[PDB]
Amino acid sequence: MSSLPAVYIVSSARTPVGSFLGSLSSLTAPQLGAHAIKAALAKVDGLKPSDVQEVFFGNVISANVGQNPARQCALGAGLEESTICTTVNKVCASGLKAIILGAQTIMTGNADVVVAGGTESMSNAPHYLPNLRTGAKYGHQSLVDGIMKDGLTDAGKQELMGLQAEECAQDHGFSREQQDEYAIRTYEKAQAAQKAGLFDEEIAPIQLPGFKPDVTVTQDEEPKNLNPEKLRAIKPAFIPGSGTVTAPNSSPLNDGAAAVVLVSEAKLKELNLKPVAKILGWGDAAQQPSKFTTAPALAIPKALKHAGVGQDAIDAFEINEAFSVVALANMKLLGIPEEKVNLHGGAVAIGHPIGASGARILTTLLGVLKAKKGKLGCAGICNGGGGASALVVELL
Amino acid sequence: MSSLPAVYIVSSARTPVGSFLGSLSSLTAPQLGAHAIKAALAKVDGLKPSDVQEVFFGNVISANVGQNPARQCALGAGLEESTICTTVNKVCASGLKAIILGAQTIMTGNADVVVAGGTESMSNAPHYLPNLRTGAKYGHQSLVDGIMKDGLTDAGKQELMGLQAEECAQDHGFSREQQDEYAIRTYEKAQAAQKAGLFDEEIAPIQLPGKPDVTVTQDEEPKNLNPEKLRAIKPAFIPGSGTVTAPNSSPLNDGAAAVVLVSEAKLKELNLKPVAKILGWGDAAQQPSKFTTAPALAIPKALKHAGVGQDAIDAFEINEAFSVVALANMKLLGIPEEKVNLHGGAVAIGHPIGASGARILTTLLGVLKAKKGKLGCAGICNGGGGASALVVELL
Amino acid sequence: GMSSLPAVYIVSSARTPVGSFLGSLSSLTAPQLGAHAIKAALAKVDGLKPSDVQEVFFGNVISANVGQNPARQCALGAGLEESTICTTVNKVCASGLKAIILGAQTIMTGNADVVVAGGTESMSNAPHYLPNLRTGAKYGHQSLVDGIMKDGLTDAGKQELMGLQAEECAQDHGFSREQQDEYAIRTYEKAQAAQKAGLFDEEIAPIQLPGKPDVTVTQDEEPKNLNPEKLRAIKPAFIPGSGTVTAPNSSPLNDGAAAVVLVSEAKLKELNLKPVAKILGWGDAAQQPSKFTTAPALAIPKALKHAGVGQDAIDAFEINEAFSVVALANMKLLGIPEEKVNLHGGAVAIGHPIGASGARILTTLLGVLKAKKGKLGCAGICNGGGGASALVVELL
Amino acid sequence: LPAVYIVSSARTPVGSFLGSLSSLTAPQLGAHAIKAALAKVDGLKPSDVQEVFFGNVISANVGQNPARQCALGAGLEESTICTTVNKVCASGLKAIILGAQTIMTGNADVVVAGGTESMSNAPHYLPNLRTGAKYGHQSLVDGIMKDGLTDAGKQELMGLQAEECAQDHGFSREQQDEYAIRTYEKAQAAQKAGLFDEEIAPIQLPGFRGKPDVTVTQDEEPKNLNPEKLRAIKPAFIPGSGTVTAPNSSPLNDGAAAVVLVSEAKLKELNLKPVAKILGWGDAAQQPSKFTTAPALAIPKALKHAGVGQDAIDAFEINEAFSVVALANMKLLGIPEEKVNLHGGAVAIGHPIGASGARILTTLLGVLKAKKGKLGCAGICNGGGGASALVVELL
Ligand SMILES: [Cl-]
Ligand SMILES: [Cl-]
Ligand SMILES: [Cl-]
Ligand SMILES: [Cl-]
Ligand SMILES: [Cs+]
Ligand SMILES: [Cs+]
Ligand SMILES: [Cs+]
Ligand SMILES: [Cs+]
Ligand SMILES: [Cs+]
Ligand SMILES: [Cs+]
Ligand SMILES: [Cs+]
Ligand SMILES: [Cs+]
Ligand SMILES: [Cs+]
Ligand SMILES: [Cs+]
Ligand SMILES: [Cs+]
Ligand SMILES: [Cs+]
Ligand SMILES: [Cs+]
Ligand SMILES: [Cs+]
Ligand SMILES: [Cs+]
Known part of the structure; x- marks a missing residue:
């Protein structure tokens, strides 16, 4: 790069x-x-x-x-x-x-x-009403929730991403209590950042x-x-x-x-x-659609390599919290301590407008680097379908 | 480039x-x-x-x-x-x-x-049913046709693309008769190409x-x-x-x-x-209701990016959103119809909108081979005011 | 009396x-x-x-x-x-x-x-029908209700189609797939013969x-x-x-x-x-909603009593064929031979526009009595929900 | 009988x-x-x-x-x-x-x-799903408007037949507003007095969650x-x-x-x-858009069928489809408002359309009981041009 x-x-x-x-x-x-x-x-x-x-x-x-x-x-x-x-x-x-x-x-x-x-x-x-053009002669018909259909459901298995989050919890050994105490911590970080301006x-x-x-x-x-x-x-x-x-x-x-x-x-x-x-650089990666939860564990190293930066040089990470378990699993797989992750809270506490979140976490990362006097940041975000994208920035 | x-x-x-x-x-x-x-x-x-x-x-x-x-x-x-x-x-x-x-x-x-x-x-x-979440307490409601809403309607004017086509006919002076004779020609070319394999x-x-x-x-x-x-x-x-x-x-x-x-x-x-x-490409854009002639900007931009003169192009694909779109862009650019859409265009072939930009590139590569040409240029306008164009060299 | x-x-x-x-x-x-x-x-x-x-x-x-x-x-x-x-x-x-x-x-x-x-x-x-547009449904797929199924053919109580209750009727009075099939053919032939003769x-x-x-x-x-x-x-x-x-x-x-x-x-x-x-008289009757199929076996004797007429005096019956088993069960239960029932065919062959059929069979009954030179007629029709209605007419 | x-x-x-x-x-x-x-x-x-x-x-x-x-x-x-x-x-x-x-x-x-x-x-209602609609926005019909509130021949909401009633018999925005206020405080007086x-x-x-x-x-x-x-x-x-x-x-x-x-x-x-x-009843009907005035036909028909004169009624319940409806029918029959809807009417109480015909009779018996009356009459107009009236004697 x-x-x-x-x-x-x-x-x-x-x-x-x-x-x-x-x-x-x-x-x-x-x-x-x-x-x-x-x-x-x-x-x-x-x-x-x-x-x-x-x-x-x-x-x-x-x-x-x-x-x-x-x-x-x-x-x-x-x-x-x-x-x-x-x-x-x-x-x-x-x-x-x-x-x-x-x-x-x-x-x-x-x-x-x-x-x-x-x-x-x-x-x-x-x-959505999908069969109005040709018609449906007889029978109850379905009105499709566009959020569920085009936002939250993996196309291959027809399963909501929350079900694939459970598969992540099972695969990587995170309990209900570990996910809940993560959530409480990221809410506390978001509240603290909010209150501190x-x-x-x-x-x-x-x-x-x-009106x-x-x-x-x-x-x-x-x-x-x-x-x-x-x-x-x-x-x-x-x-x-x-x-x-x-x-x-x-x-x-x-x-x-x-x-x-x-x-x-x-x-x-x-x-x-x-x-x-x-x-400084970026990286996209993808794996099995139901394992989208841990695709950031591929995209982040790829972005760091593209940027010519070691993982240990990063001062702050944003790992998008599609679910608490997603942050837990990617921290575990990459060996990133939580005290370097979502320092002002993440999407579990802040919100997840799906098309905007990849840019939202970058905006927040720049504020984290300024507030914490950091220099190097990395944002990573998984996506339904098996993908993830990651980007490395240097504060000037 | x-x-x-x-x-x-x-x-x-x-x-x-x-x-x-x-x-x-x-x-x-x-x-x-x-x-x-x-x-x-x-x-x-x-x-x-x-x-x-x-x-x-x-x-x-x-x-x-x-x-x-x-x-x-x-x-x-x-x-x-x-x-x-x-x-x-x-x-x-x-x-x-x-x-x-x-x-x-x-x-x-x-x-x-x-x-x-x-x-x-x-x-x-x-x-689409747009107000089921918050509800609509009283009154007839609408079911929105997704083709009209997300494909064919200018967002600012809330007018279908056919009405922008009429703006194009008025702005550049093409009559019903000129548009009809263009359409017949491009159907004839598409049928000739079909039959000839x-x-x-x-x-x-x-x-x-x-x-x-x-x-x-x-x-x-x-x-x-x-x-x-x-x-x-x-x-x-x-x-x-x-x-x-x-x-x-x-x-x-x-x-x-x-x-x-x-x-x-x-x-x-x-x-x-x-x-x-x-060899190169270019995007351009102008007033949304004038999207029909955005290719008159994108095509010169692509040629310049490609380092290629317009006269050196052996074949153009100018996407036929309407017959008037091809007519107007040929006029503005000075491109003779003898070099345009040599196997017919979207008026005769069809226009699946998300695919058409790649569709015309595939067809252009076939035109360059069939007509023994080397340099091709594809240009395609889009709702909202934009156009994209690309220049290729057949090897 | 009347x-x-x-x-x-x-x-x-x-x-x-x-x-x-x-x-x-x-x-x-x-x-x-x-x-x-x-x-x-x-x-x-x-x-x-x-x-x-x-x-x-x-x-x-x-x-x-x-x-x-x-x-x-x-x-x-x-x-x-x-x-x-x-x-x-x-x-x-x-x-x-x-x-x-x-x-x-x-x-x-x-x-x-x-x-x-x-x-x-x-x-x-x-x-x-779209049943919840006024208050809204915040999240989830929703239903478009077929008004025929909801307001015409589904028993409100058990939420069962009347066909499944016709199946319940066949199990109750012992009528096979073959017996219902051969009745349907017979009423189809009667309707075609009546059509043929004008x-x-x-x-x-x-x-x-x-x-x-x-x-x-x-x-x-x-x-x-x-x-x-x-x-x-x-x-x-x-x-x-x-x-x-x-x-x-x-x-x-x-x-x-x-x-x-x-x-x-x-x-x-x-x-x-x-x-x-x-x-000469009429009779309404009703019983268990899922047993509406045999409700005419109550309404028909009640209408004869109201008219002061005996079941053997009746020259022609119209027993509306909601299902073939309806006619078979009511004929069996009432002791009425098929040779006096739906002589020009019934709804299985003719059609069942549900709001009109009660009057349609009376119109056809008057035609049967004219054609077969009869004087006393009885029309009986069951309805979803458990009821039936019946009417006794004398051709003048 | x-x-x-x-x-x-x-x-x-x-x-x-x-x-x-x-x-x-x-x-x-x-x-x-x-x-x-x-x-x-x-x-x-x-x-x-x-x-x-x-x-x-x-x-x-x-x-x-x-x-x-x-x-x-x-x-x-x-x-x-x-x-x-x-x-x-x-x-x-x-x-x-x-x-x-x-x-x-x-x-x-x-x-x-x-x-x-x-x-x-x-x-x-979605009315064209069975045969389908290939291209264009479609309508969801509000069942209240279609089957309850719109006249079949005119395709106009009942509020417009009500404006007809005002111009036909000369009742202003004020006169209807004063009646509405009167029936409102007549209704509020009944609640607090039980x-x-x-x-x-x-x-x-x-x-129970x-x-x-x-x-x-x-x-x-x-x-x-x-x-x-x-x-x-x-x-x-x-x-x-x-x-x-x-x-x-x-x-x-x-x-x-x-x-x-x-x-x-x-x-x-x-x-x-x-x-x-x-004691008796009467149904009557006239021009559909003049349904507001149909009680003026049903009420005398019900009184005549019961063998009772208009002067003998102790209380009328005339359903207030609109305040102008009560005003109009009182004008044509010659009934003083001091003998009409003495506990309030539908403008203040509410109008569930399939029930109001029985609702006003129920309220009528309560009026006769509390006012110590003997002869009550209830009449109700309906969309399409009709009206129904009934005469009762409290015992
Ligand atoms: Cl993906
Ligand atoms: Cl654009
Ligand atoms: Cl019933
Ligand atoms: Cl009417
Ligand atoms: Cs700001
Ligand atoms: Cs560091
Ligand atoms: Cs949350
Ligand atoms: Cs600025
Ligand atoms: Cs091929
Ligand atoms: Cs050339
Ligand atoms: Cs065409
Ligand atoms: Cs290959
Ligand atoms: Cs090769
Ligand atoms: Cs006839
Ligand atoms: Cs049938
Ligand atoms: Cs006549
Ligand atoms: Cs009570
Ligand atoms: Cs009111
Ligand atoms: Cs009781």
């Missing part, structure tokens, strides 16, 4: 993460994305939105969003109609794959300024105009929901009796978007821009 | 293009895409499917297709579970942008063998489990030309004064197409025979 | 052809079929005008999406005065015959002199469908579909392997309507009308 | 749309009301009931024969004859007329009649009156010039009501104490 032209992150921003049918459920996925894009660009001293040439934006459940979600995000943010816009779907990894593709587009010389990230409005995912810089608050008083949404909705007694007492969510995965120790369904602004070396110098970070 | 690693096409393949609710409507988009991927890889002497490292696959109307359509295409084609898979949506340009991204992934050194292309099953696009090589026929088994070997739309009915039919989007009709627009269709890309190093390592070299 | 009450005369009856499910009459709504039968019945009374009709009782079971008061739509569509009293009646399969009883009673209490009664059903245009020509009012010339539906659509080896070889419909009830030996889903004109003795002479028949 | 006696009546509280009773189906509300009426008649066993007529308008998704489900849910014998009746808003009263007729012709001695409606649980407690059978809703048990004892609507908010709200069906609003119209509601009827012989045989005697 060294022999490849440099790619700088000059800013990042994210919406608050809203709960399912909660604080941001009135906004569409492109409205969330536009908000994150516009906020990220407003931070770059010396760069105009009209300088952005190309947009890659993740989005998984695109049904009823309309033509090209990424284009709607770009135009809604005030970018020029000349902007090249592509929507990316690598399930839960879409937001990070989008940033990788944006970096590659600078590296091959086809752009000098790129916005990448992702968005998801799980609240506004529709239901450590998300204030990365979050762009959302103003909802009154009625206006409402400003400022903080992530989920972290405050921790109730330790209830979390430890709730029934398993996917396997009765012997199940270890619960709604409290899994990621919720959520709404949100996140964006980063990328520039080439030449553009950085031309406009005298202050870089936040440098992309 | 030239100072970056070279990218070679070592094969390509496509399904027949089926009509809406027609010959392929029993297959899902991943089944079509897997078929095209498997068929393209079977053509490469000395390359195994297990050598494919990464897949980029276009798909626009992904509702109810399930998690990551590209990953389903890849696994359905027999690729390894280690394969990196990403689904791409740039509406009508998705299949060509997928190939571009695949080329870039080789150029940055992250893959040496990449499958790219696209798939669409418009037949199996569902309807010129699609035999690129098409991988589909066997349908049987009643006995059905084999689908031909594109469904070309035979439907009736020049008398075409000249007499009422306009489809503007009553009375309209110029765009269903016969002179692309249909709704099902199909998939795939290409196999390899690096120079890997070509040498496996002693592979390349079909073509990617 | 003699202390005014007499009620049938001066007319008519019926549409019975169409197959999504078949010949599928483009017509229930009120259009109903209007057709009412207008045809009234056109047959010399000395009576449509404006003389004062009140209408009309059966209809699956009224969803038919609009306000189906009976009122049938009346206004038939050309009846807007002063006409209109009530829609739902007693499931017996609705069409209960409407006739309620019409007779309205004369007998002296509130009307000219009454049209009958029933209609377009099972082809029964919609599907014995349905008087009672059926052909339907003209616009579109330049006009298509005309003259025959019932189901009788021609008999295929005796297909019928004996088909797999059972409700219990794989061991079931005796099949689709060929059950009634189909159908569209049709039927109406009769009732007058008081005063108006019969005041207008000098020629009566076709006299209503 | 044999006399028909009312031996008891009962009604559920009237729940608001998607409100306090929304968790109950129409047969559950109906079962509740039948059971409560039957528990009031000592000397009469629930197994003595031979026949049920029950009104219900929007029967979609209620299941087979709603009245049969009401009857069995109340504990009546499986031997009971059960028939569901739909004369739209008049179904509850027409059911009672049919029940009285069944006694008068000597086919039954104990009949339960009334009506039920759960407008909260009325579904939406004049509904006899007729209402409260409903128990037990929560740890949740607290809930009892519904009051009608939900009367407490909602805000006269400041009411006078200043915008019109509901005609902007600017309209006179009909949500506050001055009836709401959408859930509820049920039932009466027990006995023959002359059975009253003496079992030594039952009668609440009232049914």
